Design a protein around this ligand. Sequence first.
Ligand SMILES: Cc1nc(NC(=O)N2CCC[C@H]2C(N)=O)sc1-c1ccnc(C(C)(C)C(F)(F)F)c1
Length: 835
Amino acid sequence: NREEKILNREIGFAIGMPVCEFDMVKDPEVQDFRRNILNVCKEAVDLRDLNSPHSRAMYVYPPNVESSPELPKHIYNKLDKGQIIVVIWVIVSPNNDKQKYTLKINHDCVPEQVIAEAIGKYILKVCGCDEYFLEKYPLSQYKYIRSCIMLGRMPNLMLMAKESLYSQLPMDCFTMPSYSRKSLWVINSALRIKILCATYVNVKIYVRTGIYHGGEPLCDNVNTQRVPCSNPRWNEWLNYDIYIPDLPRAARLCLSICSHCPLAWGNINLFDYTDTLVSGKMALNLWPVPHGLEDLLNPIGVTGSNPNKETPCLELEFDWFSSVVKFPDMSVIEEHANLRENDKEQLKAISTRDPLSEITKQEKDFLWSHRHYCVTIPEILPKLLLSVKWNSRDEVAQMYCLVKDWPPIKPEQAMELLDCNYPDPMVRGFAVRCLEKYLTDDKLSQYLIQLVQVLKYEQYLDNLLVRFLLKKALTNQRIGHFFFWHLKSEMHNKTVSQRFGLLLESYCRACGMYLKHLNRQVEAMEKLINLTDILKTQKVQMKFLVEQMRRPDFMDALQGFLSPLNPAHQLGNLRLEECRIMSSAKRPLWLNWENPDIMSELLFQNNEIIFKNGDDLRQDMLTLQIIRIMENIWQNQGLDLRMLPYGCLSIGDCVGLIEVVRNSHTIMQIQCKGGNSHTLHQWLKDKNKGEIYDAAIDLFTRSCAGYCVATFILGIGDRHNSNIMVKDDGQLFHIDFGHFLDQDFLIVISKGAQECTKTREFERFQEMCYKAYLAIRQHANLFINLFSMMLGSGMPELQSFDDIAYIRKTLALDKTEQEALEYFMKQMNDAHHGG
Ligand SMILES: Cc1nc(NC(=O)N2CCC[C@H]2C(N)=O)sc1-c1ccnc(C(C)(C)C(F)(F)F)c1
């Protein structure tokens, strides 16, 4: 076929695993997933082609927008009576002559008004990248115009006739592949499950078991007798304290061959995606030794079986009811389940506490009793759920009248419900139902790294989170682009390869034309991915890389595609001269691309990117996104702390891409230390003289107050002279993040004086440093939720809550607002010896 086979090899390249290899998968829980049940995502395509070509265009080019419509008061003061001056680079002649035009327009206007003033047949293109002003959003909402107003930059916006884009987007529609087309509450018996034997036991060995719903034990942890290692003929019908109807929906039984150190752990759902209590013999390969865990079991893991079949396999014999028993529908459960001194104040004391606050059982019973009032205060839902034992049918039934009827909570609050705890299929249903309705495309863009890692927390392959993420990826090629590259990064993990290959190929069938560009991205990456592996010492390196991009096969894949950091950055022919290799630890690729846009000179004549291959960049993105929200809740309250949360994307295993800031000058190891202690201020002064000397100092403090407290609140690592850089408008920021939660700058704030503490400018630096954590400690629930969502990300730092206790220490969440003022002051006056 010319429509089925046209796509099934492009897909095999854009995932790296042939669709044939997943056609031959014998596991019954893949074919049911891939069938038309997910292919209702074609409705997403129906959404993206509803009103052609405007709907198609808004799909293909996603606006980059700020989540804050109303411009803040200080940014409003950054404007001349709330007015921005923008240059319009009209092109009319067929030649290269450009007719520019300058306009003074109210910052609350719209691209339609810009079109009307400059002169609907035209669209505004950001001059130097394929950023397009298309939909009816205010000018100041776009990140380009908002950043222009913030930095006082001169905004550049060329005019292009719409036909130059409407006719530049060939259509590519959706063709389906060949695969297009008792009750557990009436039994009376304890949980009685047999261990047969282990096929590949490794050298009194016993199976330690237990029922878990979360990290919470659901009964006594039944064990086996101590058989000899040679012949593990267990054959034991272990009797669990858990009565079978009491088994909850997500109650994966946890095996542990234990020599009480677990030789091998493994989770197995006590249900399945069709709500069937697993029966019959089951030979499952067990997962390797727990990663940094000395627990009695390892419920911190994935359900199902191990794809690697060389691991010790244990044989099990589940319940034999001589029939099939199904978990009741939610209607039957719901039918089954069918004051101001502290009953209103203690509740608010709980709600305002972080989810990491260990709720006492004496207070868990208080939370449990006031179900009828905790429903009125929404932000307590993450804590009411933990106030319920999953040992019981009646307890969980009582909750299912609450979390199903719970009024929706704010999206950053509903993102905690998708962690390792809260593993109920309906808790995550509520979390995703809130995340769909309230989360916006740029907040989703920030939080997508979190949402990808919580696919692994839902127990079946056809989640509702999968549906949400796929539908969003089929409407913007930023959710699509970054979702695709997140999954491609997490393909190399065998644990989630089965999920993520199917998810990827579900996306590669309905993304559209972008797949080719996506392939051209992947191809362009896999040469660089190859190139780095070829590379794994500079002049030979420089000439080798020049030779390796001058070849026609290499130069073909490395030209005319889009940046994996920004598809709006239309990469053209490589600037062969300005591409080099650093003398760094992993030797990343400094790569420069000329802009095929006619007028490259406005934003940037050339596009610069760092290509790291060897270091994980999920923690780097985690730091940069925490920085982004911290800035957005500092620069929305009027505390004009200035910083740069820039682009970062890990494209595979420990391989990724970083947008170079060319404005930010050399590292301070040379820009300040010259690879004397007065170099930084002198260099900043000689590069900024006159009446402009205010901001170049004024924005330095606001660029050092917000990063001394960010490196504090999140416990970020050491700040060497090779880790910090500085712009020329006084801005500085940190670039080499990574692992965390584990004076030259002083004289600049005092404007060159060798004595700084006595100065008033140092005092204002302190008084904005304090206001920095005044609101960050007011917004701690968001940060705790975000940190908690990355526990199963595989990051070596976020393994358990014992590491998120570090941010608890740094923010001191237990103390009162007045008492927390001196908490930072102690370490702050310890760092610089007085303040
Ligand atoms: C965001 C960003 N902007 C840069 N800017 C220049 O390097 N510039 C700016 C122009 C000249 C050049 C220079 N020598 O000054 S670097 C950088 C960055 C971000 C993250 N990690 C790194 C490295 C180099 C430490 C790593 F780890 F990748 F090797 C760099």
